[PDB]
Design an enzyme around this catalytic site. Sequence first.
Site, PDB file in Angstrom:
ATOM      1  N   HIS A 272     -91.112 -30.995 -16.104  1.00 12.53           N
ATOM      2  CA  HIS A 272     -90.503 -30.953 -17.425  1.00 12.53           C
ATOM      3  C   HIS A 272     -89.710 -29.670 -17.638  1.00 12.53           C
ATOM      4  O   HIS A 272     -88.724 -29.649 -18.371  1.00 12.53           O
ATOM      5  CB  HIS A 272     -91.594 -31.056 -18.492  1.00 12.53           C
TER       6      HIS A 272
ATOM      7  N   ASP B   9     -95.927 -34.924 -13.643  1.00 14.18           N
ATOM      8  CA  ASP B   9     -95.210 -33.750 -14.137  1.00 14.18           C
ATOM      9  C   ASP B   9     -95.501 -32.553 -13.234  1.00 14.18           C
ATOM     10  O   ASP B   9     -96.318 -31.696 -13.566  1.00 14.18           O
ATOM     11  CB  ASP B   9     -95.661 -33.456 -15.573  1.00 14.18           C
TER      12      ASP B   9
ATOM     13  N   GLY C  35     -94.159 -23.189 -24.666  1.00 18.95           N
ATOM     14  CA  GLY C  35     -93.954 -22.005 -23.860  1.00 18.95           C
ATOM     15  C   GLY C  35     -95.029 -21.874 -22.793  1.00 18.95           C
ATOM     16  O   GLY C  35     -94.853 -21.127 -21.834  1.00 18.95           O
TER      17      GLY C  35
ATOM     18  N   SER D   3     -96.239 -24.577 -21.140  1.00 15.39           N
ATOM     19  CA  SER D   3     -96.002 -25.638 -20.174  1.00 15.39           C
ATOM     20  C   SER D   3     -95.672 -25.080 -18.796  1.00 15.39           C
ATOM     21  O   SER D   3     -94.951 -24.089 -18.679  1.00 15.39           O
ATOM     22  CB  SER D   3     -94.847 -26.509 -20.638  1.00 15.39           C
ATOM     23  N   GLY D   4     -96.190 -25.734 -17.762  1.00 14.94           N
ATOM     24  CA  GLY D   4     -95.939 -25.302 -16.398  1.00 14.94           C
ATOM     25  C   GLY D   4     -96.933 -24.266 -15.917  1.00 14.94           C
ATOM     26  O   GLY D   4     -97.036 -24.012 -14.713  1.00 14.94           O
TER      27      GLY D   4
END
Lengths: 222, 222
Positions: free
Chosen positions: A41, A87, A176, A178-179
């Site tokens: 994403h 993802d 913020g 995410s990942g």
Amino acid sequence: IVGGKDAPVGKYPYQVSLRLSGSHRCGASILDNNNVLTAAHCVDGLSNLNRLKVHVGTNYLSESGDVYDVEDAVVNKNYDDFLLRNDVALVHLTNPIKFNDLVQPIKLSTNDEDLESNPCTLTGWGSTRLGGNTPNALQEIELIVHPQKQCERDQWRVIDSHICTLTKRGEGACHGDSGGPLVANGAQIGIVSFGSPCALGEPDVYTRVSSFVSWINANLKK
Amino acid sequence: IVGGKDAPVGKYPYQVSLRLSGSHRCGASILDNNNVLTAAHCVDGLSNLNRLKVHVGTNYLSESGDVYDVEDAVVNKNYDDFLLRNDVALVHLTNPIKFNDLVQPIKLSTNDEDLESNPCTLTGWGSTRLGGNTPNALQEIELIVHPQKQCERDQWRVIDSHICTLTKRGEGACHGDSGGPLVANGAQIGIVSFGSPCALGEPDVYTRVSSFVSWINANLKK
């Protein structure tokens, strides 16, 4: 991260800040000298990777730390932005990362036994409240892995390649984060993917690392 | 839709159900005989549009109603699925829709004055609870337009081309409602885009129709 605390300097040497044209976009983690792990994403919609930089060795967004350039980003071919599945992505670096006390890689979980209902750690520079600004200091928080059987009933279209966390309202991931890396027992077990926009008492959902170990190894930089 | 009620048969003739291989995926609305309006999020990731069908003239997912085939889908070139901006798309039909008492187009809002803090209507087949199954009967609910100034402070990266709604916990949009029509005064003012996964007391965000009238007119089927 909502409800967390400022992380000690150097406590999370595997933490990465992916910045686009100088601004924090997502978290990520160091796998080895040439590979960084993150959420699809975070990089799927980028047209020019020359503006995406990998920042390590620092707890602050106001600092540059050690900066590495992106050669390419490999997104899982089965990534579905609508169903929120697979993802996961790898960011290949042009030059190798120089490890030190503040910069180290993290081991990937290859065994998820006994994780449920037990503690885990999440770190990131995401908002500390919905609609809030990103904190300058890296945040840390201890969560609990939410049983898969329950998460499947609680969230939307959760499958086996997902892992969840949940404590209570007031604690959780936010924009913020995410990942970023979810860790337990010194191994990364999840990649922050989605949830119900910041600690409202619903589980946060992550990409389950163990489900993609094979894919990761197959796409590591040469 | 969470906290809504079964809609009367034929009350919302402009309502569309976009189904992929027979299963409801998103809501949409009828603009004219060859064009249906929806969210880019609903069709951007699709590769075989032969699997996507437009269903109108029915309040139930168990019924087919009048079915139309998709010729092509036009996604706004500025759609950003990370920042959640410009979430708008048009679905062009191969054959023209036959209007009747159960199938009619809806007017687009070209003037958003006096909308804030006033009532509006949302319809859709989205879940009636987070993690819940889609209801068979089309749901309807009356909401309130949340002042833009406040929405900008409540949600993440809300801009002028967004419009919001908010009443209270237990009322709001949910998975499956995306792409659907938010209406007021007999005109569509918004397209369901995103929120905080189902009526948790945070505003739901929609693509503001008035901001894309020009783009819509320019991409209408010939």
